[PDB]
Each structure stands twice: as C-alpha cells, then as structure tokens.
C-alpha cells in the first residue's frame, strides 16, 4: 500500500452512438421525439447498458438527440474498469444484431436489421475496434455540457430511486 501526494485521475467525456434498423419504412427517429418515449427509452437503453458494462453509476446517457433518418443518443463516463467493458462488449453488441435479422423472419418481422455505431471524433466504429487506447482520447477529447442537460440529470436521478435492484434478501 504505497501513498503520499492526492491523484486527480479525471476521466470523463462524451460519445454519440447512433442507433438505426436499416430500414426506410419505418421512421424509428420520429419515435423517440415523444418525451414519454425518450424516457421509456432512458430506462431501456440503461439496461442494455449494464449488460455491456455500463452501469448507471459510470456510465449514464446525458441526453437523446434527433436527427436525420438515425438517433443519436450522448453517453457519459468516469470508471476505466466498465470503459473497456463499454467498448468490448459494444463489438459483442454488433454481432447480436445480426441474429435479430434472421431471428426476425423466424418470430414475426420481414427484417429488423440493427447497429450501433461510435463517433466521438476522427475515428469511426471501424477506427475504434483496432485501438481501443485511441476511442478515449477521443471521448475525453471533448469535454460534457450539462449546461442543457440539467432537467435530465434530475430525470435520471429520480429514476434511480424508483429501481430498487440488488434486495437485501
């Protein structure tokens, strides 16, 4: 157990992701412009972040942008450990789509075709899986703004205290 001076170790940024079907007979980004939706979806996409390594005390979403036929959708972080889960499992993550396509015929759908892709500055989703030192020079390249975001860190916060995971018995 070395020690002596107080470490600063900040690490902390923001990345866009964008989230698209494939398809272009179904407006999927109209969808999410609902606030009830934008929500619902907060919780969802939590989740499905947990499972990657992105728990709701590192990783949380600072807000969900619209924008042409894709959402994008703003991840903050703070913890290393459940950084590289975040971008590990994300290639995980793209792999499982490609089930859903063939999963769709079999259950119900024509093709629901989805991915996730990384922009959090000159290196795309093909730049990031090679080097994974370089994605968080990218998103700790550009600092948050919680400027505009203040009503959703209340949104968050309060849906933190409706969850009660982890009982006690």
């Keep these: 157990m070395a020690a002596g001076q107080n470490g600063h170790e900040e690490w902390v940024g923001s990345a866009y992701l964008f989230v698209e079907s494939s398809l272009d007979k ?15 979806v907060y919780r969802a996409l939590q989740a499905a972040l947990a499972e990657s ?16 036929p894709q959402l994008i ?11 590289g889960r975040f971008l590990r499992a994300y290639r ?3 792999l499982r789509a490609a089930l859903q396509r ?9 093709s629901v075709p989805l991915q996730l892709e990384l922009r959090a500055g000159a290196e795309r989703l093909d730049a990031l899986l090679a080097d994974e030192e370089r994605c ?8 948050p703004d919680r400027l505009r975001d203040e ?14 995971g982890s009982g006690a018995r």
């Design 151 to 164: 009503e959703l860190a209340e949104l968050e916060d309060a849906l933190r205290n409706l969850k009660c």
């Design 73 to 83: 959708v703003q991840l903050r972080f703070c913890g290393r450990q459940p950084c």
């Design 102 to 110: 063939s999963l769709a015929a079999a259950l119900a759908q024509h």
């Design 92 to 94: 995980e993550g793209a």
């Design 53 to 68: 390594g992105g728990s709701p005390d590192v990783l949380q979403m600072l807000k969900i942008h619209r924008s042409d």
């Design 26 to 40: 179904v407006v999927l980004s109209d969808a999410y412009a609902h606030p009830q939706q934008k929500v619902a």
């Design 136 to 143: 968080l020079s990218c998103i700790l390249a550009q600092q």
